Amino acid sequence: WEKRMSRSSGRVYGSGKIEEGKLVIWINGDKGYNGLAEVGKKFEKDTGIKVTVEHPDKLEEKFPQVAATGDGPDIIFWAHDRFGGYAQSGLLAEITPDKAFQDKLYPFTWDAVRYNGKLIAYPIAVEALSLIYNKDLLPNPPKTWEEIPALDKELKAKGKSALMFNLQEPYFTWPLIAADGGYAFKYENGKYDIKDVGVDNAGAKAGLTFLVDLIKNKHMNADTDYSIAEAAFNKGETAMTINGPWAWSNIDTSKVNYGVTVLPTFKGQPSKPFVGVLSAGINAASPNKELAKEFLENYLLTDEGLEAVNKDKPLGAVALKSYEEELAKDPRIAATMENAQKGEIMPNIPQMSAFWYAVRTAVINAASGRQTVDEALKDAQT
Ligand SMILES: OC[C@H]1O[C@H](O[C@H]2[C@H](O)[C@@H](O)[C@@H](O)O[C@@H]2CO)[C@H](O)[C@@H](O)[C@@H]1O
């Protein structure tokens, strides 16, 4: 009864699900996938190996599902935080760059893709949220979160608003939650403590309460998502937004005269955005691991490869030492680094998936009023 009702009963996955002799790459739709496809086409021109870049919706949830059956892309791009879960499930190949190649990338970026002593992805770029502001509406961005309500009252009189950003993904609210003490998992003595979650302490509660108060006082709307905030800022309807380097391209196209700067402080403390390392993992069921290695090491992670992607959508602070130096001049990147400094590198442990889902629910429910801050964060905690 037990076996025969389960899909696992005498189950052997089919062969040839992932096509040998080509590369399929998944990357998020807010990244420079058209630029990545340019690198892929160069690879095809040189080597005859076709590269297909796709940007599926919710790829970070689709990948573990399809890869578990030996299907999916040869290469998956995502922030490093999801990869430990993939690795634990046996979905990622350990990557084997030689010492010469490892020397080309910053050591801390290799650390972000290390799991149980193994490298499980290639690091590409360091991402951190910054405060983005309309210099025409706001020549001087606020130093503190606390002064934003007063700013909104000013701009509401002019038919504008102070601030809009994605409230549907907890990634964007985390800088405020972590500012005065909130944390995900406590890193102590070489390991994250999965029983030590800091989403319901005094600091986290204070931060989320300030967010909820902004909404209660009609300075923000609870259902604002990525597209709503991006559209509003790039139309010049709101003075500020919170976003990463990938967003700069659309603002460059917009008519907005904008700047990128340090996130405001909360209770005198710097906002602490979670830092992500955009990373490329190789599917453990791929028959093309040698092709993937060649593409990633000798085509993408070069000055020419990163330039192609960066020209589509800015990567931020790239992990490649040689190319990072060329872009260090950019004040937007400098601001990105400053915020990344003040923040924390995301854990990559398998528990991150559940953590993000819990905090997503908590932030959405607190913001919309489905739950109080105390109720919401209590649930998020273990
Ligand atoms: O909001 C939870 C979400 O946060 C992070 O995702 C970021 C990603 O790192 C960025 O590159 C960009 O695409 O925005 C995303 C948020 O919408 C985590 O990496 C992710 O695992 C988590 O679910």
Residue numbers in the entry: 8 to 389
Paper excerpt:
In order to reveal the atomic-level details of co-translational folding, we determined the structures of a series of nascent model peptide with increasing amino acid length. For this study, we chose the human Pin1 Trp-Trp domain (WW domain), which consists of 35 residues, as our model peptide. The topology of the WW domain composed of three strands and two beta-hairpins, which form an antiparallel beta-sheet. The structures of the intermediate-length (WW11-MBP, WW17-MBP, WW19-MBP) and full-length (WW35-MBP) WW domains, which are fused with MBP at their C-termini, were determined with X-ray crystallography.
In this study, we prepared WWX, where the X-residue N-terminal WW domain fragments is denoted using the format WWX. WW11, WW17, and WW19 take an alpha-helical conformation. The structures of WW17 and WW19 form helices in the same manner as WW11, in which the region of the residues 12–15 forms helical structure. The most prominent difference between WW17 and WW19 is the torsion angles between residues Ser16 and Arg17, however, they share essentially the same helical structure. WW19 also forms no beta-sheets, even though there are four potential interacting pairs of atoms (O of Ser16 to N of Gly20, N of Ser16 to O of Arg21, O of Arg14 to N of Tyr23, and N of Arg14 to O of Tyr23) involved in the antiparallel beta-sheet in the WW35. This result indicates that the hairpin loop 1 does not form the native-like conformation in the transient structure. On the other hand, the residues 17–20 at the C-termini of WW17 and WW19, where hairpin loop 1 is formed in WW35, take more extended conformations, while the conformations are stabilized by a kind of the short-range interactions. It is plausible that the residues 17–20 are the origin of the transition from the short-range interaction to the long-range interaction because this region has a low propensity to take helical conformation. In the presence of 30% 2,2,2-trifluoroethanol (TFE), which simulates the physiological conditions, WW17 and WW19 contain about 25% helices and do not contain beta-strands. In addition, the crystal structures of WW17 and WW19 revealed that the region of loop 1 is different from that of the wild type.
